[PDB]
Amino acid sequence: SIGIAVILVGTSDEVAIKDAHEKDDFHHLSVVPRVELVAMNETDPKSIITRICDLMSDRKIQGVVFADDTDQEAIAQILDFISAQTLTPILGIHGGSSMIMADKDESSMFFQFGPSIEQQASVMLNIMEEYDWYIFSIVTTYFPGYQDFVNKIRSTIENSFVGWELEEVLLLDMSLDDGDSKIQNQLKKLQSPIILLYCTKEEATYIFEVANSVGLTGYGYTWIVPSLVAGDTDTVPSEFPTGLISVSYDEWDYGLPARVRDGIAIITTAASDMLSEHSFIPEPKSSCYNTHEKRIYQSNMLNRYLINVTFEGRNLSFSEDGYQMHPKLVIILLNKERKWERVGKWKDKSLQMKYYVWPRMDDHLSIVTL
Amino acid sequence: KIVNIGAVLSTRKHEQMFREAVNQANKRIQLQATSVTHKPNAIQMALSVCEDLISSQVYAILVSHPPTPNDHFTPTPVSYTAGFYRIPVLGLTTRMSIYSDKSIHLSFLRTVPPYSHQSSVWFEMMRVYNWNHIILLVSDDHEGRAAQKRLETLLEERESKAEKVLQFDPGTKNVTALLMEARELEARVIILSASEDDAATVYRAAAMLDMTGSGYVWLVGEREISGNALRYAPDGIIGLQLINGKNESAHISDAVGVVAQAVHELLEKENITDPPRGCVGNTNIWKTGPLFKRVLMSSKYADGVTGRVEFNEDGDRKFAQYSIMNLQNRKLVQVGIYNGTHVIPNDRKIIWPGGETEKPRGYQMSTRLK
Amino acid sequence: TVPQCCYGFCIDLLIKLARTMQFTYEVHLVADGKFGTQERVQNSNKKEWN
Ligand SMILES: *[C@@H]1O[C@H](CO)[C@@H](O)[C@H](O)[C@H]1NC(C)=O
Prior knowledge:
Largest sheet of chain A: 7 strands, mixed
Strand order of the largest sheet of chain A: 7-6-8-9-10-11-12
Strand content of chain B: 15-25%
Distance between the termini of chain A: 73 Å
Helix content of chain A: 25-40%
Largest sheet of chain B: 5 strands, antiparallel
Number of helices of chain A: 9
Order of helices and strands of chain B: EHHEHEEHEHEHEHEHEHHEEEEEEE
Radius of gyration of chain B: 23 Å
Oligomer: part of a larger assembly
Bound molecules: 2-acetamido-2-deoxy-beta-D-glucopyranose
Number of strands of chain A: 12
Structural class of chain A: alpha/beta
Distance between the termini of chain B: 77 Å
């Protein structure tokens, strides 16, 4: 008897969640779980904390599956703080909870769905070596994990036979006052036909407006951006130049009713696995106030059993930082008008694009030989 | 117009002192005083602080440590809650190096310097006594890593690499094997930056191995010279101290002064908008605080009880005062001061460990090679 | 690890050099058996020799 709660923010098909809760086979595992669904708005951190406290005090909740619809990022940090304070684990399946955080402390029970910065950096180079763009430059601002991105990018390209000639790096800071002139002067140093960017949505919009003022965004330069710049597919800032390439999680074929079942299955299978061998189960009085003395029963073993699970012929083996190790990504391109289209999806490290030659969007010639 | 600030203290008498200080500063656009107490849990702290954030729509928050010894988690709720709104926060008695990280804590300022500057002032002793070869041991923690990195970065200019860097796991009870390796080495200067508990473990093991005889030098810091370490502590240890570290009234008497100069230059510049008082209501970011941080950090303060206070581009106080603190015959006596960038002697004479009265070379020539 | 005795152009040069400077020595061969280059370990930023 383990209680699991699910929290939704914003509009969602509530009846679909109820129908899909009992959608898998959970008979041969002694979990007998109960599903509790509660809906609330995005009022504030205080409301979220109060709701979580009330729920965990109400009926024997040992874990929370959290959903969200807004694109805010600090909600992940707040949830990580809560998970650090109380030993119960929580899961982020969609929304702002899917954003990757800087560095979870050594005592946090918190996991997210979605690739990290390093895997997206790796795929940005797998995309490059297929349409033969061997010349590129990188520009980025101050964001958590910015050093890891450039470090991995530089490490990958210096241990291969193919020749990547990296033309200068830019780590400009846009938070300075009256530094816009300096930023505009520095942006003129870019010469490679391929540009890599790592910035927040508003930072990306400001930088793109500045670049369009300079004019190096019209015909021959192509930009590649990470997942977090998009955030919401529908909300097009209208400042993004045509031809932008981005990598995003496959939300088109993987909506939400399946994610709830997948998240519940992780907890159920982990609890079943840790119960049988160890003949124990963490069932403390999950108090809300005066929780410093409630840390008597260590749940670190449950954490060790949370990082290696599988079900229905799928791999969900996590890592030390708390992310997939095996996500399912897609590649999206912004066409002539403001809209996003699927170009190619790759699984198990095998790139598969639906195009063979990049559509150009005259001094481009053809050569025949023998 | 009317502008109000906020603060949280750990004593009702301290609250009255803060009220008296703000009443005195009113003679220098009228200010206000808001203060609350501390709770033994972080979630209640966050709930109260955003509840009290709604109370008066504060512009700056002052935080102080409680009588608890560790208090490592006490500043965390306020920092997270304030950074959720990008509201700058000034700290008074926080010394852990975690809060110096600009990534997790975007808005945070320090009234006292961190331990990294202690590691930096360790350099002047070597500079003035011609000690070029040292052995340093630090614990496996985020605290030690920053100090080691800063020390080796500072020593990079001198092009004098330390011979050995060795570490031990935190919270251990046996370090005999590790101390064995350093005994074989050829350096006689030991610098340790560990926790208070680990200070007792290392000091006990050093005595057994005859490690603290003649011809040895120990350079320690604030944490391992206080506490229960003096129960088992050899003579001749050279420590460190701060002139006005523990006088919370001295800081407060001028902490409100430096912020008062900043608001004068901000209230009449442009586009001033009060940060929202809607704890529950608004979830956006206040426009005021990206520019407020820039002006505040560069606000030079002419003169104060602790001298000139000028902030670098790190949110940490610069030009602190250190007293080279010495122990002889089971009591501590001052022997010098750290004048900003250099040191001067004093009337008293330092007695080195082992009873010898000289300046040990810190070197023992070896006559066997490999 | 079994004791062995070595001799050659380098060994007797060391003997003559050692007698001048009044020091002793205890030679031992390398374990891996390579001259040494830089390598990337465990796919990390740091690099170490062999
Ligand atoms: C510190 O040393 C300098 C020497 O450059 C001296 O002028 C000054 O008076 C000393 N004391 C202080 C407080 O600066």
